[PDB]
Each structure stands twice: as structure tokens, then as C-alpha cells.
Design a protein around this motif. Structure first.
Motif, mmCIF file in Angstrom:
data_model
loop_
_atom_site.group_PDB
_atom_site.id
_atom_site.type_symbol
_atom_site.label_atom_id
_atom_site.label_comp_id
_atom_site.label_asym_id
_atom_site.label_seq_id
_atom_site.Cartn_x
_atom_site.Cartn_y
_atom_site.Cartn_z
ATOM 1 N N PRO A 129 -4.089 2.314 14.564
ATOM 2 C CA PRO A 129 -4.074 3.336 13.418
ATOM 3 C C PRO A 129 -5.471 4.536 13.533
ATOM 4 O O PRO A 129 -5.161 5.500 12.848
ATOM 5 C CB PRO A 129 -4.072 2.524 12.122
ATOM 6 N N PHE A 130 -6.243 3.877 14.130
ATOM 7 C CA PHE A 130 -7.543 5.042 14.503
ATOM 8 C C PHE A 130 -7.313 5.614 15.330
ATOM 9 O O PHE A 130 -8.383 6.589 15.530
ATOM 10 C CB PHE A 130 -8.737 4.127 14.056
ATOM 11 N N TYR A 163 -2.373 0.985 6.066
ATOM 12 C CA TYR A 163 -1.882 0.645 7.584
ATOM 13 C C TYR A 163 -0.649 1.418 7.546
ATOM 14 O O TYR A 163 -0.494 2.455 8.682
ATOM 15 C CB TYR A 163 -1.843 -0.420 8.124
ATOM 16 N N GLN A 164 0.406 1.295 6.914
ATOM 17 C CA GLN A 164 1.586 2.147 7.310
ATOM 18 C C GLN A 164 1.259 3.531 6.601
ATOM 19 O O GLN A 164 1.717 4.430 7.509
ATOM 20 C CB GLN A 164 2.620 1.530 6.084
ATOM 21 N N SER A 220 -1.765 -6.756 0.833
ATOM 22 C CA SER A 220 -0.768 -5.695 0.453
ATOM 23 C C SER A 220 -1.587 -4.441 0.281
ATOM 24 O O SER A 220 -1.008 -3.441 1.044
ATOM 25 C CB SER A 220 -0.363 -5.946 -1.072
ATOM 26 N N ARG A 221 -2.598 -4.007 0.094
ATOM 27 C CA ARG A 221 -3.420 -2.885 0.175
ATOM 28 C C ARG A 221 -3.624 -2.600 1.594
ATOM 29 O O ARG A 221 -3.375 -1.377 1.778
ATOM 30 C CB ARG A 221 -4.774 -3.030 -0.792
ATOM 31 N N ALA A 229 -6.520 9.028 5.661
ATOM 32 C CA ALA A 229 -5.801 7.941 5.564
ATOM 33 C C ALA A 229 -6.614 6.837 6.348
ATOM 34 O O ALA A 229 -6.975 5.635 5.989
ATOM 35 C CB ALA A 229 -4.443 7.989 5.964
ATOM 36 N N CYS A 230 -7.144 7.079 7.518
ATOM 37 C CA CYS A 230 -7.832 6.300 8.355
ATOM 38 C C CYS A 230 -8.967 5.764 7.800
ATOM 39 O O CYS A 230 -9.668 4.814 7.823
ATOM 40 C CB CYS A 230 -8.211 7.010 9.698
ATOM 41 N N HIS A 231 -9.913 6.921 6.995
ATOM 42 C CA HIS A 231 -10.949 6.390 6.121
ATOM 43 C C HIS A 231 -10.926 5.162 5.481
ATOM 44 O O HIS A 231 -11.496 4.187 4.955
ATOM 45 C CB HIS A 231 -11.735 7.545 5.601
#
Lengths: 46, 632, 235, 78, 36
Positions: free
Chosen positions: B250-251, B482-483, B476-477, B439-441
Motif C-alpha cells: 500500500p505504501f 488498507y482498503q 478493523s481500522r 491514506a498512506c499516512h
């Protein structure tokens, strides 16, 4: 002494590994039901 | 020749063509494109002679014939022009040179290469000297078409090479294999995943020649690339793999390939997801939703048997349709797709008819003459001998472009007709970059507080057996973040590829160990996937096991396992393990290798973070498949 | 030890404690690293061990922070060779040492405030290097202005100068101003604080001054958090 | 004069590609076949997937395609 | 299997069939290798 004389029945990493490899539960559906009397009706419905 | 053809020897226009050569995948069907330079060199009546060298032609249940003429073109003496293209060898040589970008300072545009490939494909179809030029420039043709161009150019070159293979000249298979192997070292620098897909399809077909050479090339490249792939794993990626089973990066913003499902659509990063609205339906049927378009399916209240229903999809604009995928539907017997821009009865075209859509999914992959349609009619015929009241047929997925280029819409460049955007796309790409960085942060901050207890005590084992509530909420978070990161990464890569499409329409060009150093992680993973599949098929087709023993010895096998099986994706892990069993499972050191791996990875002094459960499942599978080896 | 490894963090906490007991040891530490070619491990160890009043004072008086800032500014506008790979490690080092309020005041001082504009100009390089530097710069500014009115004024001045909104700048503004400020809360008690803990193994290597065991807790909470919520997080 | 000899600009390449293109014969050809081959109406063949809406622009098989089923006669294998 | 009907017009239908057969043969070979 008692700590020496018992083994822990709490689940450990062996159970964790089994779970990783994929209140009480009715196991009757998985079994096969027979009777000693040859004339008995099949009991699988039970 | 047969007596009839000997009598009509001078009248032959297309040499005897084996009926089997025209077969379709079904095994009992097919088509022959009777053509030749003699047919082109002419202008009223013909004879189709079908002779069998139930017996022979008696097995030919049904036949049909159609004739297709050349398009009417304003070009003067177009018949003489076609004679010219077919005759002159200098023409073929200069076509090859422009395709290879060895002329005019390599400033040939991607559209120019596409047109050159169209001409070459037509020439190869007509013929069956051009083969000599292709073989002499094969390395460079493969290089430019599979490692420096897009999916469409690679697919067109794959078609050209297929036609060349189908053709007293030296066998083309060995020469194509040599070219592909010579270019293999440049796989890390390949521009697009869809291009690598066709490259490896051709290499897999042509590996039957010189099995040892392909084996050694694939092994060397895989060993070179696995080290770099392992060296690029971050502790955060390890945490995502182990705690959550998430194996994406993801990063890392750069992807290399997207698939939907050698049995799936490939190279979907170069195309856009195509949204559509249901405009007309047959009877009371409708569509329901049960960036990418939402999954949508046709609900039909009454299916009957052999009953036709239809749904009309409006993309809202003429869209360059390039890829289509419809999930298999057992509720219907056949599915037909028609396409039209202005109206069904005005410019209606039949896109496809699938008769095995009940036992196979519909997959149209990279239409080489992509349609420029706007309206999409799907006609579904219910299954024969079926009266399932209600049917839910997944509409599927459709990809392409919403910005047709001037040549793409050009109606003169097709068969049987009937800069501002770049600025906007770059603005969208920058927006997506910013959102994806945010989002990556978010994911980074959430993961920096994520901790994975080692499985070395009963309390940690209980933690894994019963995940505590706070752990559940944290997971869950993490999954949500990640999604979000993966969706934004997909959007960013799609936007980058669209920007590259626009900059490639405008004159531009798309781009040994430094190659591997500079490759993206996803590109390396895709290369490893293809190499592992190639090696597995190599072993299946087995002297290839004689080679791969100088390499893949105890030390090489251990290094490959450590680089790929521990950190690789589930598929890479599985395939590396199975390859290692098939290769070294029967070796004396094999059991020692397994025990050493187990010791190193599962002893309590190991700090390496990895999916212990998945690696253990792999080890159990590998040992079971090598249990004939007494040493295990 | 490799950098970011939790064991290295714990050993560096031990080094920090020893330097806090013997300040001269920090000098010896700086002596053993050459305080030039400072690797990322050197920076991590120095940042961790320097988290004491005496240690931070000696670090500032050694001139290493000034040399690092000057070299970073020279890199951005283009006495130490700085490559794009060392920018993110150096920014992280400055953030870690800026955990201290003394280094936070220094980072907002006249000698360092050119570095803020230099970074913003540089970002407003390889793509991976650019992303790493962007993340490090966002973290550096967030640390510098974190609950620091003077540094808040300085950063507002720098941003206004830049504006006198897309790319790095939009992300920076969103992360820094359009997100709630986070403060570190250090709770001590005469009794253990058991709430919020998990029986499984967890290595939370914080600064040794935050203690260990059940009587100490460290939270990272938005400044909007009510004290009742703080208490509920521990009891 | 000939496109083959001219430089490969986008115009020349487009001209060559246009030369290579094809169309379907708008009027259907006539066919004479052996007796064992028996024609079938194109509407019958395309009954499952009709092309009648396309018939306006000569897209249906009745305008360009001929079809025959084979009767297993004595010399049908030949 | 389910070719696009527009390949009929040109000379690239056999080439596309051969490409799809290539892909299917490779997929079958991989599947057989994975299921030894």
C-alpha cells in the motif's frame, strides 16, 4: 509439588496452529445410526 | 497435388490449406481465411475445393462461405499499391526498421508503430522474404514490442509472431525463442504488465525448443530478482502479511499489472473502468448493483427455457471499448453482445456470441481493433430445459477509454465500417497522489501502533486463539485504511497510465542488474510469478531437470526458499515451494534443507517477521510431496 | 543492530539513561561517532541517547545540529556532503531530538528557520526519495509546531510567504492544520493502571523517563480530548 | 507515386493500413454445390442470435453468407 | 471460446485463436504441474 503433578489443559500454540490450519456442538448429524434388530426402520432421520 | 488441382494447377489462388488449421478452441468448429498474394493481385467467380486425403469429408457436418473485399480507398491505383506492398522486399525491411525505431532517429510514434504492426499483420495473413527480415530483426522487434510499448502493441506483435509461426525456410520457433531469451534480461524494465503477459505467452509456447536454454535463462533471472524482492520487504509489509494476510504494497504507489479472471484479463492498468446506465430492458427485467463501477446484475423475473431477454447499457458517450468480462452464468444457454454508437439499426455491430457462457466466463481481452461504440446490448437466452422463475445474471465488467483519440475514432482505419484532456488528467493524477499520500499516512500511523505478539508462549497463543476486542477494532481500522490505500493506489496507477496514453498519442516514447535495482516491487513480483510458472511448465514438459542442478542446489534452493517462500505473496510462495519439490525433492540434501529451514525460521531466537502459519502449511505440503525421499 | 529494530530502541533507551546519569558519556558517544559521515544508525542512536537536558545541551554545543541543518539547506537550494537519501534520515533525527523543548525552540530559531523555507521550496529527487522527504518534512513541521505558539507563528509566516494549493502543499496543509493537534500525556499514579493493557507480549519502547510497569502510562491524544476521557483510558 | 516508396509518416502509414482493410460483400454471392450439400436459410442459422435489426446496414448473414448442411451420400466423404 | 465476431472481417482470427490456444495450453501445463 502440585505444579509438578499437573499439565496445563489451557490451550497453547499447538491449538493456535491447529486453528491456523482450519455452547457445545451437536455431532449426531455427522454420525451413522444403526440398530441390532434387522427389522428396525432406518433411524438416520433422528 | 490431387488430380483435380493438377488439372486446375494454374487456377489455384490459395494453396491447399489443412482443415484442422482452421479449428476453433471447441475442437469441432473453425474457419479458414482463404487468401494469398495471387488473390490480392486480381479483381468474378471462384472455386472452393475441399478434398479429404464416417470418413474424411463425411465428418464435415456443416459448411458456410463468405467473401470479403478490400475497403474502397481514395488512394490512386490502390490495386497497384497493394501489389507494391506485397511484392517489394525493401518495403518489408523498412517496415521492420520503423517498427524497431532504427530509422528517423527513433522518433516513431506509438501510433506509427501500431500502423506498421497492422501492415505487418496483414502481410503475414496474406502470405500465410518478410520472414527473413522478421528473423533478422527478431530480437529488436521483440524488444520494442514487449518491453518499450503498451499492451495493444504487444498484443499486435504477438499476433504478427503467431502468423509468422503458422508459416522451406528455417523454423521460426527456435529463432523466436532465442530472441525472447535474449530479451529476458530486460523484463525488469518492461513498460507494462499486459506486454509482459504476451511476451511470456509466446515464450511459454515456444519453449518446447531448446528447453535447457529457457530453463537456465528463467532460473538465472529468477535468482537475480528474488534477492532484490526480498531486500525490498519492509517491516510494515511484513506486519501486514503476518497479522492480516495482506500482501499488497500500500505504501508503494507503483503497480505493474491488474487482473480480473493465463485464464484472466491482463494489463488492466492501461485501461479505465467503464461505467454504464441501464437504458432499455426486455419485459420487466432490470439491473441492480449486486474508480471501478459497482457490481451489477440483471434480475429477470421469468426466465423460462430458451427464452431471449436483453439489457441495453449506455456508457453516456462513445467509449473505446477494449476489455470485457462477464462471470459465467449457468442460468442461460448463450449470451450475445452487440454494440452500436448511433443506433442499433444504424451502426449496429455484433461484438461477440458465447455459447459456452454457461460453463465458461466471457472474456474479451484487448480487442485489437477496439470498437468505438457507446451502447451495449446483452441478449441472454435462458438455459434449455430450465424453468427457474427468477434469474440473476452478473452483467460483468467492461474496460477501455472514455477519451477516443482522433485515429481511434477514425472510421477509415477500421474493417467494415457503418491536450486539454491531458491537463485535466494530470490534475486528477495530482489530486489522487495527494489523497493516496494522506491514506498512506493514515495507514502508517495506524500500523505503527500495531503489535504482533510472537507465538512463543501460551499467552500469545491465547491472544491468537481469542483475538481481544481492542485487537479486533484495531484490525478493523487497519483493514479500512488498507482498503482505502489500495483503492487510491489503483486509481493513481490508472490515472498515470491514462496520462501516459495521452502523452503517447502526442509524440513520446515509453522509457542488467541496475535494471532489477530500479524495478518496482510489483514488477518484480509479476516477473517472479511468470518465471515460476514458466519453470513449473518446463518441468512438466520434461533434460531440463539435468540442468537446474548446477543451479538450485542445496544453497541455491535454500536462498530461493528464503527470498520467495517466506516473504513472497501466497501464489509466489506456493509456486516456489512446489517448484523446489519437483526439482530437488528427490535430492539427498532435501530433508536436511527442510529441517534447516524449519530450525532457522521457527526456533525461538528468530526475530524475522513472517506468516508462520502460511509458511508452516507450505512446509507440510512440501514435505508430504517429498515424503518418498527417505531423508525428509 | 539494524535501525528501527525494537531491540535497538531498548538499547538506545539504556544509552539515554546512562547519558542522563553521566552527561560526559554523551560526549564520549559523540566522540565515537566522529562529532563527517553519519549513517542512519548513528543518527538513531544519537537522537535516542540525546534526549536529556544535559545531553541535548551538549548536542547543540557540539555543532552537529547546526551542521546538519546547514547541509540540508544547502541540499534543498541546490559543509557536509548530503544526498537525497540522507535528507529523510536527517529530518527524522531532527524530529526525534526535537521531542525536547530546547531543540524545539532551536529549530524555530533564526539559524534554523531558513531550513523550513528551503524544505518547502524543494518540495513545492527520485519518486521514492521525494515521498520519504515529504513524509519526513510533514513529521518535522508537526513536531516543531506541536503545542508551540512561537513555532506555529513561524510556520504560518513561512506558508504565507509561500502563498504570496496542490501537490505537497495541499497534503501538508491537510495533515498539519486540518487535523487535530496531538499532545503526549504522561500519567503517573501511586497505584497500577491496568485498563487498556493486553496479556500478550508488546514492546512499547518509550523514553525511559516515562517509567515502566503498571503505575506509568503514556498516551498520544488530540488536544480536544477531555480529561474525563483521559481517565477513562486508564481506569 | 507508390506509397511503398514514400517516407513512413503517419499519413503514409494510415494510407497503407486503409489499403489493408476489408469489408463484407454487400450483395450475396450465388453458389452451386454438389447435391449432397443442401442450403439453409440464413434466418434459420441465426435464429438463436438474430441479426434482423442490423439487416438495415447489411449486417445480417442473409446478405453475404451462404450455408449448406452435408447429406452423407455414397461419395460424400470424397 | 467466445471470440469477438469482428475478427472475422480481417486476417487475424486464426492468429488470435492460436494465441488463445497458447494461453490455454500454458494454463493447463501450470495446473498439471501444481497437481502432481
Amino acid at each position: 509439588t502440585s505444579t509438578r503433578a499437573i499439565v496445563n489443559t489451557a490451550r497453547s500454540m499447538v491449538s493456535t496452529i491447529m486453528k491456523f490450519l482450519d455452547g457445545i456442538h451437536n455431532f449426531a448429524p455427522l454420525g451413522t445410526i444403526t440398530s441390532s434388530s434387522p427389522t428396525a426402520q432406518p433411524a438416520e432421520v433422528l | 497435388l490431387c488430380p483435380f488441382l493438377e488439372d486446375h494447377k494454374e487456377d489455384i489462388l490459395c494453396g491447399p490449406v489443412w482443415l484442422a488449421s482452421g479449428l476453433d478452441l471447441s475442437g469441432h468448429a473453425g474457419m479458414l481465411t482463404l487468401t494469398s498474394p495471387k488473390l490480392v493481385k486480381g479483381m468474378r467467380s471462384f472455386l472452393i475445393h475441399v478434398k479429404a486425403v464416417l470418413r474424411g469429408c463425411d465428418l464435415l457436418q456443416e459448411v458456410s462461405v463468405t467473401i470479403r473485399r478490400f475497403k474502397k480507398t481514395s488512394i490512386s491505383k490502390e490495386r497497384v499499391q497493394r501489389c507494391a506492398m506485397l511484392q517489394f522486399s525493401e518495403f518489408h525491411e523498412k517496415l521492420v526498421n520503423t517498427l524497431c525505431r532504427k530509422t528517423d532517429d527513433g522518433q516513431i510514434t506509438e501510433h506509427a508503430q501500431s500502423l506498421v504492426l497492422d501492415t505487418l499483420c496483414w502481410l503475414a495473413g496474406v502470405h500465410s522474404n518478410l520472414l527473413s527480415k522478421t528473423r533478422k530483426f527478431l530480437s529488436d522487434i521483440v524488444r520494442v514490442c514487449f518491453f518499450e510499448a503498451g499492451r495493444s502493441i504487444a498484443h499486435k506483435c504477438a499476433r504478427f509472431l503467431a502468423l509468422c509461426i503458422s508459416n522451406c525456410q528455417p523454423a521460426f520457433g527456435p529463432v523466436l525463442l532465442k530472441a525472447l531469451l535474449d530479451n529476458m534480461s530486460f523484463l525488469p524494465a518492461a513498460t507494462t504488465g499486459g506486454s509482459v503477459y504476451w511476451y511470456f505467452v509466446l515464450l511459454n509456447y515456444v519453449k518446447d525448443e531448446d528447453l535447457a536454454g529457457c530453463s537456465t535463462a528463467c532460473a538465472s533471472l529468477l535468482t537475480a530478482v528474488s534477492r532484490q524482492l526480498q531486500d525490498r520487504l519492509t517491516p510494515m509489509e511484513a506486519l501486514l502479511q503476518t497479522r492480516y494476510g495482506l500482501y499488497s504494497s500500500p505504501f508503494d504507489p507503483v503497480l505493474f499489472d491488474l487482473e480480473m479472471s493465463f485464464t484472466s484479463l491482463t494489463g488492466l492498468l492501461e485501461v479505465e473502468p467503464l461505467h454504464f446506465t441501464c437504458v432499455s430492458t426486455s419485459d420487466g427485467t432490470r439491473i441492480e448493483r449486486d474508480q471501478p463501477p459497482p457490481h451489477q446484475s440483471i434480475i429477470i423475473e421469468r426466465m423460462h427455457s430458451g427464452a431471449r431477454r436483453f439489457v441495453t447499457l449506455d456508457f453516456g458517450r462513445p467509449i473505446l471499448l477494449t476489455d470485457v468480462l462477464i462471470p459465467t452464468c449457468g442460468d442461460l444457454a448463450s449470451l450475445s453482445i452487440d454494440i452500436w454508437t448511433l443506433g442499433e439499426e444504424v451502426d449496429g455491430r455484433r461484438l461477440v456470441v458465447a455459447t459456452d457462457i454457461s460453463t465458461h466466463s466471457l472474456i474479451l481481452h484487448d480487442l485489437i481493433p477496439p470498437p468505438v461504440c457507446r451502447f451495449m446490448k446483452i441478449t441472454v437466452i435462458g438455459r434449455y430445459g430450465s424453468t427457474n422463475a427468477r434469474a440473476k445474471i452478473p452483467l460483468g465488467f467492461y474496460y477501455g477509454h472514455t477519451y477516443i483519440l482522433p485515429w481511434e475514432s477514425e472510421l477509415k482505419l477500421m474493417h467494415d465500417p457503418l491536450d486539454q484532456h491531458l491537463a485535466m488528467m494530470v490534475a486528477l493524477q495530482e489530486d489522487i497522489q495527494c489523497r493516496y499520500n494522506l491514506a498512506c499516512h493514515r495507514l502508517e500511523t495506524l500500523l505503527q501502533s500495531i503489535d504482533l505478539p510472537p507465538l512463543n508462549s501460551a499467552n500469545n497463543a491465547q491472544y491468537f486463539l481469542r483475538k481481544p476486542d481492542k485487537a479486533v477494532e484495531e484490525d478493523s481500522r487497519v483493514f479500512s485504511a488498507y482498503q482505502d490505500c489500495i483503492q487510491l493506489q489503483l486509481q493513481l496507477n490508472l490515472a498515470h497510465n491514462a496520462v501516459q496514453r495521452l502523452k503517447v498519442a502526442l509524440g513520446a516514447s515509453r522509457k542488467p542488474e541496475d535494471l532489477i535495482q530500479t524495478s518496482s516491487t510489483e514488477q518484480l513480483r509479476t516477473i517472479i510469478r511468470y518465471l515460476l510458472d514458466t519453470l513449473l511448465s518446463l518441468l512438466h514438459a520434461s533434460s531440463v531437470p539435468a540442468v537446474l542442478q548446477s543451479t538450485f542446489h542445496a544453497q541455491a534452493c535454500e536462498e530461493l526458499f528464503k527470498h520467495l517462500c517466506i516473504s513472497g505473496t501466497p501464489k509466489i510462495r506456493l509456486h516456489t515451494g512446489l517448484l523446489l519439490v519437483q526439482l530437488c525433492g528427490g535430492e539427498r540434501w532435501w530433508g536436511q534443507f527442510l529441517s534447516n529451514v524449519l530450525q532457522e525460521l521457527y526456533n525461538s531466537e528468530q526475530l524475522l517477521i513472517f506468516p508462520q502459519d502460511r509458511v508452516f502449511m507450505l512446509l507440510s505440503c512440501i514435505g508430504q510431496r517429498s515424503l518418498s525421499n527417505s531423508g525428509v | 543492530l539494524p535501525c528501527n529494530m525494537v531491540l535497538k530502541k531498548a538499547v538506545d533507551s539504556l544509552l539515554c539513561s546512562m547519558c542522563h546519569v553521566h552527561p560526559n558519556y554523551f560526549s564520549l558517544l559523540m566522540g565515537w561517532m566522529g562529532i563527517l559521515a553519519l549513517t542512519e544508525s548513528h543518527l538513531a542512536t544519537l537522537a535516542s541517547s540525546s534526549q536529556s537536558p544535559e545531553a541535548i545541551k551538549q548536542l547543540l554545543d557540539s555543532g552537529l545540529p547546526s551542521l546538519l541543518v546547514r547541509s540540508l539547506a544547502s541540499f534543498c537550494f541546490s559543509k557536509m556532503p548530503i544526498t537525497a537519501d540522507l535528507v529523510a534520515p536527517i529530518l527524522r533525527f531532527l524530529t526525534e531530538v526535537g521531542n525536547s523543548h530546547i531543540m524545539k525552540d532551536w529549530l524555530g530559531g533564526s539559524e534554523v528557520n531558513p531550513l523550513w523555507t528551503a524544505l518547502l521550496f524543494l518540495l513545492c529527487l527520485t519518486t521514492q526519495q521525494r515521498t520519504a522527504i515529504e513524509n519526513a518534512t510533514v513529521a518535522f513541521f508537526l513536531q516543531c509546531i506541536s503545542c508551540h505558539p512561537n513555532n506555529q507563528k513561524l510556520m504560518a509566516q513561512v506558508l504565507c510567504e509561500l502563498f504570496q494549493i496542490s501537490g505537497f502543499i495541499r497534503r501538508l496543509f491537510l495533515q498539519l492544520m486540518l487535523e487535530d493537534e496531538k499532545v503526549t500525556m504522561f500519567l503517573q499514579s501511586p497505584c497500577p493502571l491496568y485498563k487498556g493493557r493486553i496479556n500478550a507480549t508488546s514492546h512499547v519502547i518509550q523514553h525511559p523517563m516515562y517509567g515502566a510497569g503498571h503505575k506509568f502510562r503514556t498516551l498520544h491524544l488530540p488536544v480536544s480530548t477531555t480529561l474525563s476521557d483521559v481517565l477513562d483510558r486508564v481506569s | 507515386d507508390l506509397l511503398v516508396d514514400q517516407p513512413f509518416t503517419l499519413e503514409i502509414l494510415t494510407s497503407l493500413v486503409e489499403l489493408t482493410r476489408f469489408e463484407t460483400l454487400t450483395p450475396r454471392f450465388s453458389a452451386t454445390v454438389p447435391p449432397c450439400w443442401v442450403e439453409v436459410q440464413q434466418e434459420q442459422q441465426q435464429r438463436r442470435h438474430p441479426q434482423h435489426l442490423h439487416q438495415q446496414h447489411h449486417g445480417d448473414a442473409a446478405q453475404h453468407t451462404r450455408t449448406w448442411k452435408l447429406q452423407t451420400d455414397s461419395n460424400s466423404w470424397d | 471460446q467466445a471470440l469477438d465476431a469482428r475478427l472475422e472481417v480481417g486476417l487475424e482470427q486464426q492468429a488470435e485463436l492460436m494465441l488463445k490456444m497458447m494461453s490455454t495450453l500454458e494454463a493447463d501445463s501450470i495446473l498439471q504441474a501444481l497437481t502432481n
